Amino acid sequence: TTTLAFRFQGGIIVAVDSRATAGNWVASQTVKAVIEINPFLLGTMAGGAADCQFWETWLGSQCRLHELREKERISVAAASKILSNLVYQYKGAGLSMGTMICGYTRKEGPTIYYVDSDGTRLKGDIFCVGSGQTFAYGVLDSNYKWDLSVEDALYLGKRSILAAAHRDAYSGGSVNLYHVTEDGWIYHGNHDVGELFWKVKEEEGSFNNVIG
Amino acid sequence: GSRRYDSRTTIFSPEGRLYQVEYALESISHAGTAIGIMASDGIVLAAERKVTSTLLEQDTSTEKLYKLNDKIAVAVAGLTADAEILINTARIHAQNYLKTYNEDIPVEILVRRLSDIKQGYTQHGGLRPFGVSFIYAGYDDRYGYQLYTSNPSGNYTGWKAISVGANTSAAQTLLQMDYKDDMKVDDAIELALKTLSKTTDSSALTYDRLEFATIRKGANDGEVYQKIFKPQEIKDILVKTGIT
Amino acid sequence: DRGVSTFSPEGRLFQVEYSLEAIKLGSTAIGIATKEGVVLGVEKRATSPLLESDSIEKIVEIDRHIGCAMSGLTADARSMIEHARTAAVTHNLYYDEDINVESLTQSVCDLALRFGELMSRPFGVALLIAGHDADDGYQLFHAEPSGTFYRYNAKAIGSGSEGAQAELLNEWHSSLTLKEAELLVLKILKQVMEEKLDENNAQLSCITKQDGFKIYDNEKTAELIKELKEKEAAE
Amino acid sequence: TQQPIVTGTSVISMKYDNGVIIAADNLGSYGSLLRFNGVERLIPVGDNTVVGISGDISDMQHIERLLKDLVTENAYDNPLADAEEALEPSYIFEYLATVMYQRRSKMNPLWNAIIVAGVQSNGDQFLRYVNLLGVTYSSPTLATGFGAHMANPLLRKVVDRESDIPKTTVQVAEEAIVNAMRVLYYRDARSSRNFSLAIIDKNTGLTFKKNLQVENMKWDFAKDIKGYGTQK
Amino acid sequence: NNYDGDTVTFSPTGRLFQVEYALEAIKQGSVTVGLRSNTHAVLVALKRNADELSSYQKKIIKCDEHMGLSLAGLAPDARVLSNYLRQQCNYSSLVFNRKLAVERAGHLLCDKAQKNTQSYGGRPYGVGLLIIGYDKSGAHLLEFQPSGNVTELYGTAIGARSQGAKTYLERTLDTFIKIDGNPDELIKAGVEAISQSLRDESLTVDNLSIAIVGKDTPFTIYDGEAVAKYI
Amino acid sequence: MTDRYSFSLTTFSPSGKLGQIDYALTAVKQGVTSLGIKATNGVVIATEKKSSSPLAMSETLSKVSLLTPDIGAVYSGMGPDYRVLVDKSRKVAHTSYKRIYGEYPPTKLLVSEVAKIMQEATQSGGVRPFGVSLLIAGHDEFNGFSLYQVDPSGSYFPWKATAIGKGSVAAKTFLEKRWNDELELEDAIHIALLTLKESVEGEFNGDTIELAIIGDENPDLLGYTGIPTDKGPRFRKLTSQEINDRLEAL
Amino acid sequence: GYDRALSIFSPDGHIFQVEYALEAVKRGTCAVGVKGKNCVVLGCERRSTLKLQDTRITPSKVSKIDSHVVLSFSGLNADSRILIEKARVEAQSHRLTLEDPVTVEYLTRYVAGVQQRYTQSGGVRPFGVSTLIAGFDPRDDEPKLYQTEPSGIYSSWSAQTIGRNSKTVREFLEKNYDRKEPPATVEECVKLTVRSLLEVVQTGAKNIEITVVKPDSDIVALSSEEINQYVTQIEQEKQE
Amino acid sequence: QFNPYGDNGGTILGIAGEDFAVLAGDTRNITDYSINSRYEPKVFDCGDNIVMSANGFAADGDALVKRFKNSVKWYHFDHNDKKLSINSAARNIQHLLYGKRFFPYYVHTIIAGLDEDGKGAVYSFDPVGSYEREQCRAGGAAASLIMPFLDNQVNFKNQYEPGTNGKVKKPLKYLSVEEVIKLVRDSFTSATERHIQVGDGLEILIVTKDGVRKEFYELKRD
Ligand SMILES: [Mg+2]
Structure with missing residues (x-):
């Protein structure tokens, strides 16, 4: 698994792979590593599939109850903290979670919180989580700018997952792209890594080590 | 079942009064008068023991004045047994605070805590309230010398001079007449004894019918001393002030 | 005295x-169900002109597809609303779907008789629960403190209820439009209210399949009041 | 969590055309010590069910009491306790299976392997297995422990599938069971010669045979066996 | 008192x-x-x-x-x-x-x-x-009272004006007990029984509620136009 | 079941009276007279053994009880209430003191614990107050000899000498005339016997009078030798013969 | 535990x-709340039956729940402390979990919820307290003023009074407070609040307390002399 | 030490068609190297046109199916006999599984049926409740033998159109129920040859708008 999320001028880009493994055995190539908490909030899946799915679905229920009671959209700060405080209660029991809670509100602007099963809650501009995180970070760090266009930002996130999918054995399958705006997230399609790799190789001139 | 025998101690009257609190206050009005007077250089606590006997061992007796810690003392008016329950709780609270913060408990925080306990008995539990009114005499480095009172309702207020127990109306009028802001402890000692001497239901005010205490910075330098007066020392101050 | 859960000889x-007598003293709330939606309307009844009337919240959202209006001791309704909201959201969490309006109403009514010597007394408030689901369409329920709930084509609760219900008896038919229902609630509210009805002392709301539950703006309701006045003067 | 102390070995069983047969030896082992020689491990429940139990004997005696209590409880306010509302093999099994799985789920199992053999109200044969893990399964033949490895292969030669059941008589089934018990006596070091056998038939009812012995044993060929290779 | x-x-x-x-x-x-x-x-x-x-x-x-x-x-x-x-x-x-x-x-x-x-x-x-x-001993009807008294009966009625239906069933006892293998006729007898308890109002399509259970019949409730057949 | 009386049975009346406490004091007033006198070198507590029947063995009924080796107690009022209070008092002397400090509590603090128990029966749910007044005599190293009265309300007062129960008013007047701060223990016993004779109707002897003292340490009653610091109990119950000997010099 | 249903319905539907x-609450000293254009003022009556009081240490009638919200009350003083403590705890709990201070409406809704709970819980009596809760929502300049009462109902007010003779001061406020143009300045708002209390108070000496709350956690209590200047100016205009 | 878990072997397979769905599983039950039963049903009709199988530790599998069937029953009681949709059943099973997150049901659960648009649906669960809607999913012992085959023969992975040489993929044409059953039978026939825990019998449950149908096929018994 490889998941990333970064803040930029046009909001947040979220990009993930689609592979799930049980040892060396590739269990799935079609897993959804982005959990659609609600129309405005996204969460990434890393570590425990069930733990992430279950509690981020639960998080959406808590966010919905909040806006019913307070008649106002929940902040990313408050939403992330509900999840982090929950998993902190279970600390030591064996939950496995590494997630980015991503949202775009009026008061905050585009916001990302890295939330983790040992209780960590970090606000940040760029996060990368998973077995292929180091590969994605390399492409991200060298090409990231705040003034990226939505088009170029989407490509950067796609290209960074591809970098991980190539080198990391446990990452691959397909790339899912999301763009988070103030009015909600927008899905930018599923991209098979097999087809994407050759396309990127030719158009970009990268991966000269690989024969195609 | 059991409902039949329930007096319902925590209900409002049609007028919005708490029956049991009001009746507990009626009980307290028959207790020996306790007076507290705050001066610039200390606090005085004076209190009348109720119709005593010659065979009562006075020097080992304590029914009115109690030490909560080295900085805070209380004068009691009402059921002595009820008071000792609360006093022990207050002593524990003061020590809990000292253990937690490594500083002596501020007077008001102690007073609020005890008053909140009293309040609870008027709102829930179905138990009778504590038939006790306290005068708190204490010192801390924030507000300096402080006098408070609390009653069975759990309401508390701050005072320059105050009385509880019997004849508080008469006592408060006398204090209001002769009290001044620039007053000193030695003057306050005299006022307290003179007020008791006039309001007492006894024929004459003597040493064996009194409990007396002072909280002074008359402790060598930058510290506070509590002085629970001995029977002979009460006898001397009665002669000094010209009452006997 | 006597048990809180005691039966009368009847x-x-x-x-x-x-508790039903306390509800009779409450402000009027009216609901009308149509095939185009369910309308909910309430009398705000501010005790003084200095009271900011938009803070009077007697119509409340339970979920996107379920709304609720109250009459009686309105403070008692808060925990009922909390439970309803929790039940609606919890069912969505467990079943990845909307909860049926009846099932929501039944869940609220289960609280009603949980009193004794649990809470110390019944609720002193009645609820009109309106909503939509795919199985039974647009629905309006009347939830009482007895634990009983009846489904209604139209229903009025509160102080002007029996006068309003008699009026709803004559006016309701199975072909009512949403617009017709809105005016009808306004008409009957105006009839039973002490003070003169306007956009500040009365509130409208509705639930439709498309847009879900919506509380009407004072500007939107004001237009419907003006539309009502003209059509009554039209004959 | 525990360890079995006093234990019973194989329980074997099979279906035949009109009912079921079940059998188990009368030994209570204490490790390698053949401590108790008169232990009944087949426990009848009514006239239509026999529960065969292997593994820990203290837990067997507990289960025996649960079944006895079950019969008492079923008779309470039950005018048809000896007729339409009598205990069925399927009721008795499901109860035990519930208890076994609950006990393993509390990490405090009944250290047993159980086979419930019987005939239902409609005459249908009942034969189902349950163990300390709460694992259940049914088959034309069922056996626990060593019986699973040695008896099943023999019993499956008689009834290999469901369609072989109507073709199998009670004489053939009993013969196969008795032979299997002999084979287990030859080869299981925690077995005894003495055993019990029960037949539950839809026509002739419950026939419970005690104090049976393994007979017709072959040992004579042992005299010719000398040394371990080269000895003459 | x-x-x-x-x-x-x-x-x-x-x-x-x-x-x-x-x-x-x-x-x-x-x-x-x-x-x-x-x-x-x-x-x-x-x-x-x-x-x-x-x-x-x-x-x-x-x-x-x-x-x-x-x-x-x-x-x-x-x-x-x-x-x-x-x-x-x-x-x-x-x-x-x-x-x-x-x-x-x-x-x-x-x-x-x-x-x-x-x-x-x-x-x-x-x-x-x-x-x-319907259980292993056939069809059954019970009457429960909140006093705790539970009674097994061939037929009965409870509620307002239930005495009329109860007398009818007491007369019809020998007839309706014999209605075996004919669900419609047994319901007819029940609809005719409950009719002896009606005053001013009659059985309409949204008024009547019927339920049946039997030998090869799961417990099913009939409401709306499903009971028009019996009106 | 469950104790569903979680509410106070003692409450303030409009006049500020706690009825149940007043009524408990009335029960004490009906009780047999008991008294206590403090001397310079000891304390004496005494009461009448009002035998309910002559067939009853009044020696088996102990009105004067040892609480600790240096503390004793006597009562007036309801006997059964006293008996259970003695059980609680003995236990609380261990649980809230001896098991903490490795020594027996001083008189005033044990009295304080007994007083607390009696106060709680005046406020706690579903109970009535204790229908007894206690007189507790004792000695401890730092306070010396002392005598305390404990009432149904939980209030306690230290006395030089006092009496409770039936003829307390007359007995207290008798004690006021005789008591001084120079009394030896034998003088206090003599005065106790004189005072007690006035409130007793029938037989007045060692078999009808129960009397105990808090005085010198009794190494003969310790039960072991070898530890110098352990010198024995100061509580001693006088025998029937010891009382009769002092009734001749009466 | 003590479970007795003290709050119950009567035949006429009243609790x-x-x-x-x-x-x-009717017996309690008068409290008044008035919101201007950019402030809220809380006025409180101090009964002068108690002199020889130490005003430094005596519990003040207006209490800060947080740095941006205040609470005043009429009714039982001891009861109010329990509500104030709970409100203060909840205010910090809200900051801890939501990472944002409470809105005035939220804090009111919480306190009102506590009051309601005590009207249908076994073994407890209702709070003999009505409250006025005032302040400004975080990063908001719109004044907020809410009222609660023992039943647990709450609502927003342009101006409101509670306690003894509150009928009289509400009469004053209803004719003197214009909604189209609220007290534009702190001065005007304080003046109108002091004026409203002078209808009921007696002497304008130490009997009137005034607390001004402005946006962004700007809360200050006026002193005797500052209030005395308002009292002086009001009556000098009245002599005409 | 007591081990509360066991392995009863078995292999299951769920395939979602255009307007149908199949859930197949072998009928063999084992422990270690012994056969417990040659016919012990593993795929169950749970009502509301839903079929289910919980493969792995059979005691946990039986418990879960039993609890889900019970959940279907109570769903009808509580919600006016409303039909439990396949997506709603899936979410419900997640909560059943996650309820034992710290003492899991040691099973791989698959359910099959039709969604609310009448299209074929399969849902796949891990032991602790994580789930996903899938087109094709094998579970159990021989899952690694079957899934690669299905990628190739159902999704036409690595297959390209002759003449184009890798430029044009083989188009994903819809499969009939008859075509799917052929792939299921061949999957289990192959799995039976190469996996010792697979054999004896194959029971397939087919789900359409008309209801649930069963088909049984023999497998090698060695
Ligand atoms: Mg094989």
Whole structure:
């Protein structure tokens, strides 16, 4: 698994792979590593599939109850903290979670919180989580700018997952792209890594080590 | 079942009064008068023991004045047994605070805590309230010398001079007449004894019918001393002030 | 004294019957169900002109597809609303779907008789629960402190209820439009209210399949009041 | 969590055309010590069910009491306790299976392997297995422990599938069971010669045979066996 | 009088007035009829509406595939008791792979209602129930009273004006018990029975509620146009 | 079941009276007279053994009880209430003191614990106050000899000498005339016997009078030798013969 | 535990314990709240039956729940402390979990919820307290003023009074407070609040307390002399 | 030490068609190297046109199916006999599984049926409740033998159109129920040859708008 999320001028880009493994055995190539908490909030899946799915679905229920009671959209700060405080209660029991809670509100602007099963809650501009995180970070760090266009930002996130999918054995399958705006997230399609790799190789001139 | 025998101690009257609190206050009005007077250089606590006997061992007796810690003392008016329950709780609270913060408990925080306990008995539990009114005499480095009172309702207020127990109306009028802001402890000692001497239901005010205490910075330098007066020392101050 | 869960010689629970009397003193709330949606309307009844009337919240959202209006001791409704909201959201969490309006109403009514010597007394408030689901379409329920709930084509609760219900008896038919229902609630509210009805002392709301539950703006309601006045002067 | 102390070995069983047969030896082992020689491990429940139990004997005696209590409880306020509302093999099994799985789920199992053999109200044969893990399964033949490895292969030669059941008589089934018990006596070091056998038939009912012995044993060929290779 | 303040108090003649007042709530309730043959058991219930805009209060509740009841009195109490029956039916199936006998279901309801009549703080149930079911001993009909008394019957009725239907069933006893293998005729007899308890109002399409259970018939409830056939 | 009396049975009346406490004091007033006198070198507590029947063995009924080796107690009022209070008092002397400090509590603090128990029966749910007044005599190293009275309310007062129960008013007047601060223990016993004779109707002897003292340490009653610091109990119950000997010099 | 249902319905549909709790509020000293264009002012009556009081240490009538919200009350003083403590704890709990201070409406809704709970819980009596809760929502300049009462109902007010003779001061406010143009400055708002209390108070000496709350956690209590200047100016205009 | 878990072997397979769905599983039950039963049903009709199988530790599998069937029953009681949709059943099973997150049901659960638009649906669960809607999913012992085959023959992975040489993929044409059953039978026939825990019998449950149908096929018994 490889998941990333970064803040930029046009909001947040979220990009993930689609592979799930049980040892060396590739269990799935079609897993959804982005959990659609609600129309405005996204969460990434890393570590425990069930733990992430279950509690981020639960998080959406808590966010919905909040806006019913307070008649106002929940902040990313408050939403992330509900999840982090929950998993902190279970600390030591064996939950496995590494997630980015991503949202775009009026008061905050585009916001990302890295939330983790040992209780960590970090606000940040760029996060990368998973077995292929180091590969994605390399492409991200060298090409990231705040003034990226939505088009170029989407490509950067796609290209960074591809970098991980190539080198990391446990990452691959397909790339899912999301763009988070103030009015909600927008899905930018599923991209098979097999087809994407050759396309990127030719158009970009990268991966000269690989024969195609 | 059991409902039949329930007096319902925590209900409002049609007028919005708490029956049991009001009746507990009626009980307290028959207790020996306790007076507290705050001066610039200390606090005085004076209190009348109720119709005593010659065979009562006075020097080992304590029914009115109690030490909560080295900085805070209380004068009691009402059921002595009820008071000792609360006093022990207050002593524990003061020590809990000292253990937690490594500083002596501020007077008001102690007073609020005890008053909140009293309040609870008027709102829930179905138990009778504590038939006790306290005068708190204490010192801390924030507000300096402080006098408070609390009653069975759990309401508390701050005072320059105050009385509880019997004849508080008469006592408060006398204090209001002769009290001044620039007053000193030695003057306050005299006022307290003179007020008791006039309001007492006894024929004459003597040493064996009194409990007396002072909280002074008359402790060598930058510290506070509590002085629970001995029977002979009460006898001397009665002669000094010209009452006997 | 006597038990809180005591039966009268007629076979009724004293406390439940007494809570019904408290509801009769409450401000009027009216609901009308149509095939285009369910309308909910309430009398705000501010005790003083200095009271900011938009803070009077007697119509409340339970979920996107379920709304609720109250009459009686409105403070008692808060925990009922909390439970309803929790039940609606919890069912969505467990079943990845909307909860049926009846099932929501039943869940609220389960709280009603949980009193004794649990809470110390019944609720002193009645609820009009309106909503939509795919199985039974647009629905309006009347949830009482007895634990009983009836489905209604139209229903009025509160102080002007029996006068309003008689009026709803004559006016309701199975072909009512949403617009017709809105005016009808306004008309009957105006009839039973002490003060003169306007956009500040009365509130409208509706639930439709498309847009879900919506509380009407004072500007939107003001237009419907003006439309009502003209059509009554039209004959 | 525990360890079995006093234990019973194989329980074997099979279906035949009109009912079921079940059998188990009368030994209570204490490790390698053949401590108790008169232990009944087949426990009848009514006239239509026999529960065969292997593994820990203290837990067997507990289960025996549960079944006895079950019969008492079923008779309470039950005018048809000896007729339409009598205990069925399927009721008795499901109860035990519930208890076994609950006990393993509390990490405090009944250290047993159980086979419930019987005939239902409609005459249908009942034969189902349950163990300390709460694992259940049914088959034309069922056996626990060593019986699973040695008896099943023999019993499956008689009834290999469901369609072989109507073709199998009670004489053939009993013969196969008795032979299997002999084979287990030859080869299981925690077995005894003495055993019990029960037949539950839809026509002739419950026939419970005690104090049976393994007979017709072959040992004579042992005299010719000398040394371990080269000895003459 | 002085002995009706709670359920824990006998009167001087040995009566329990709170239980009797709970019994009174049933008499105020709408009429419901129960009857059975040797193959089937039928419930017929007259549903009551609040007014012309309101729905008709449901009277029949399914407890299992082979068992269910009709109610008269406090509906929320019927929901509590029917929920308890659902659980007990379910416990029997899950633990013992056994359908709960109707007679045993009656015993459980009796005992549950009894505890509320001997303890302080609580109150008796304010509802009467007619339980029908088909088990291993054939068709059954039970009558539950919140006093705890449960009775097995061929036929009965509870609610307001139930005496008319009960007398009719007492006359028809020999006829309707013989209606075997004919569900429609057994329901007809039940619809004719409940008709003896009607005044001013008659059986309409949203007024009538019928339930049936039998040999090869799961407990099913008929409402709306499904009962027009019997009007 | 469950104790459903979680509410106070003692409450303030409009006049500020706690009825149940007043009524408990009335029960004490009906009780047999008991008294206590403090001397310079000891304390004496005494009461009448009002035998309910002559067939009853009044020696088996102990009105004067040892609480600790240096503390004793006597009562007036309801005997059964006293008996259970003695059980509680003995236990609380261990649980709230001896098991903490490795020594027996001083008289005033044990009295304080007994007083607390009696106060709680005046406020706690579903109970009535204790229908007894106690007189507790004792000695401890730092306070010396002392005598305390404990009432149903939980209030306690230290006395030089006092009496409670039936003829307390007359007995207290008798004690006021005789008591001084120079009394030896034998003088206090003599005065105790004189005072007690006035309130007794029938037989007045060692078999009808129960008397104990808090005085010198009794190494003969310790039960072991070898530890110098352990010198024995100061509580000693006088025998029937010891009382009769002092009734001749009466 | 003590479980007795003290708050119950009567035949006429009234809960007398809740209604008698309102009678305790009627007895309490008068409290008044007035919101201007950019401020809220809380005025409180101090009964002058108690002199020889130490005003430094005596519990003040207006209490800060947080740095941006204040609470005043009429009714039982001891009861109010329990509500104030709970409100203060909840305010910090909200900051801890939501990472944002409470809105004035939220804090009001919480306190009102506590009050309601005590009207249908076994073994407890209702609070003999009505409250005025005032302040500004975080990063908001719109003044907020809410009222609660023993029953647990709450609502927003342009201006409101509670306690003894509150009928009289509400009469004053209803004719003197214009909604189209609220007190534009702190001065005007304080003046109108002091004027409203002068209808009821007696002497304008130490009997009137005034607390001004402005946006962004700007809360200050006026002193005797500052208030005395308002008292002086009001009556000098009145002599005409 | 007591081990509360066991392995009863078995292999299951769920395939979602255009307007149908199949859930197949072998009928063999084992422990270690012994056969417990040659016919012990593993795929169950749970009502509301839903079929289910919980493969792995059979005691946990039986418990879960039993609890889900019970959940279907109570869903009808609580929600006016409303039909439990396949997506709603899936979410419900997640909560059943996650309820034992710290003492899991040691099973791989698959359910099959039709969604609310009448299209074929399969849902796949891990032991602790994580789930996903899938087109094709094998579970159990021989899952690694079957899934690669299905990628190739159902999704036409690595297959390209002749002449184009890798430029044009083989188009994903819809499969009939008859075509799917052929792939299921061949999957289990192959799995039976190469996996010792697979064999004896194959029971397939087919789900359409008309209801649930069963088909049984023999497998090698060695
Ligand atoms: Mg094989």
